[PDB]
Amino acid sequence: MVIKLESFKKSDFKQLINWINSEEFLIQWSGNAFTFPLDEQQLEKYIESANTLAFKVVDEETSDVIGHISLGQIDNINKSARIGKVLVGNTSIGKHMMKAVLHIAFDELKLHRVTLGVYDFNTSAISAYEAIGFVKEGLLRESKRVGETYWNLWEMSMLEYEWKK
């Protein structure tokens, strides 16, 4: 019930790697950002990436880290950014994590548009995002290759007047 975001650091790398146990789960979580297996050299490159904020999700009651989230593609010209790398490591927590990052994107960074992508079979996550204000814009058909098949990605967004009004 009480979560906060903190900066994701080297000491949090191993926990994240242990949560990402398959190539398909890696892709569901992060798309084209990484190769399987996830490892510390890739995570170092991730946190050092320009225009990317990496966060661990902390349960304030226990101090345990229970997930991960990122605000990336921070674009100061178009005033936009993309939420991604959404992970609820321990068994809505997702809603609280999204609200915390939306506060950063809209209220601290003063952005105009925040995007998100979710693969179409993750209907529970899509419903949760729609409940807090994300809107489906379009389904990017067979846009991610996974082995010999292709996944469809729902491109979703929220504009500043949907958050602030």
Stretch that binds Zn ion, among 1-9, 23-31, 83-91, 106-114 (CB under 5 A): 106-114
Choose, by CB under 8 A, the member of 47, 122, 159, 163 that binds its own copies.
159
> Are 55 and 98 a contacting pair, CB within 8 Å?
no
| Residues in a beta bridge with 6 | 56
Q: Which two tokens stand for residue 158?
A: 């929220």
Q: Which does 96 bind (CB under 5 to 8 A by kind): Zn ion, its own copies, none?
A: none
- Name the segment binding Zn ion (CB under 5 A); options: 49-57, 75-83, 89-97, 103-111: 103-111
**Token match 């960074």: residue?**
109
Q: How many CB atoms lie within 10 A of CB 137?
A: 12
Asked if 37 is part of the footprint of its own copies (rule: CB under 8 A), the reply reads no
Q: Is 126 helix (H, G, I), strand (E, B) or coil?
A: helix
Judged by CB under 5 A, the stretch of 36-44, 63-71, 100-108, 117-125 that binds Zn ion is 100-108
For its own copies, the closer of residues 57 and 111 by Cβ is: 111
Binding-site partner at residue 157 among its own copies, Zn ion, none, CB < 5 to 8 Å by type: its own copies
Residue with tokens 């996830």: 38
Longest dimension (CA), the chain: 44
- Decide if residue 140 touches its own copies (CB under 8 A): yes
d(CA 60, CA 40): 26
| Whether the Cβ atoms of residue 12 and residue 19 lie closer than 8 Å to each other | no
Q: Site map for its own copies, 93-112, x if CB under 8 A?
A: -------------------x
The H or E element containing residue 7 is: strand 3-7
Binding of its own copies by 149 (CB under 8 A): no
155 lies in the site for its own copies, by CB under 8 A: yes
Q: Which residues bind Zn ion (CB under 5 A)?
A: 108
